Amino acid sequence: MDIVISGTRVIYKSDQKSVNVRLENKGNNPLLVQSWLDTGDTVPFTATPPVSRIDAKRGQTIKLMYTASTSLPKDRESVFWFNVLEVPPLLQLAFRTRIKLFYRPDGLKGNPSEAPLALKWFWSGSKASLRVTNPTPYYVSFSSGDLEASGKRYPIDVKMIAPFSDEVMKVNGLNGKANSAKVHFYAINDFGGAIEGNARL
Ligand SMILES: [Cl-]
Numbered sequence: 001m002d003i004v005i006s007g008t009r010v011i012y013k014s015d016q017k018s019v020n021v022r023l024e025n026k027g028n029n030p031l032l033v034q035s036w037l038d039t040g041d042t043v044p045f046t047a048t049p050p051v052s053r054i055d056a057k058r059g060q061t062i063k064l065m066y067t068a069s070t071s072l073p074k075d076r077e078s079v080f081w082f083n084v085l086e087v088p089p090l091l092q093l094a095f096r097t098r099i100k101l102f103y104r105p106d107g108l109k110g111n112p113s114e115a116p117l118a119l120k121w122f123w124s125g126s127k128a129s130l131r132v133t134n135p136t137p138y139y140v141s142f143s144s145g146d147l148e149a150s151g152k153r154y155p156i157d158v159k160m161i162a163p164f165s166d167e168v169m170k171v172n173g174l175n176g177k178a179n180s181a182k183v184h185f186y187a188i189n190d191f192g193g194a195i196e197g198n199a200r201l
Helices: 112-118
Strands: 003-005 009-013 019-025 031-038 045-048 051-054 059-066 078-087 095-104 120-124 129-134 142-149 152-155 165-170 182-188 194-200
Touching: 003 078, 003 095, 009 019, 009 059, 019 031, 019 051, 031 045, 031 059, 051 059, 112 182, 112 194
Parallel strands: 009 095
Antiparallel strands: 003 019, 019 059, 031 051, 031 078, 045 059, 078 095, 120 129, 129 165, 142 152, 142 182, 182 194
8 A cells, every 4th residue: 555544543522623634645656545434344424535636755634524414422432434545547456444533522531541441351251252341431442462371371352342332352272261360451542552451350
């Protein structure tokens, strides 16, 4: 992919009339580029310009705008996908990249960077897995995580966990519950940086 998005996620605070996302063409040829929002494969947003020509080594700011055509919840975050599809101007190959957009109503309890600490973790029985509960109004997203017991480490197939919900996450290479296990993880903050955390099962 020649088109690069500035940032690995977008935060859309509800009091903003719009939010900008920047695209850059790092490649050597110009590209036709489409930008849009969807729910992850209708959506109360526009992205403009929806189609642009971005020359080599030049860029384009995309304006994302909430339309309230549908009302989003005001008591929790909502997540969307910001998509970018490039194609060089017969038959032709093209490429698509997506990053998350979190719609964040103003005034939610607590802070999003603290939501990973608030997660509760449980063994999920029998093919080991964990049940994880998010008591907060924020998504929690991870870059990686693992379970450790008796000096052995087992990667977790981490998944994003929605506000006020449970998710089960698989533990790789572990048959069943281990004694005195601990979870360690790196969640992702608004700026794409790491939030380290841990929990004892
Ligand atoms: Cl992510």
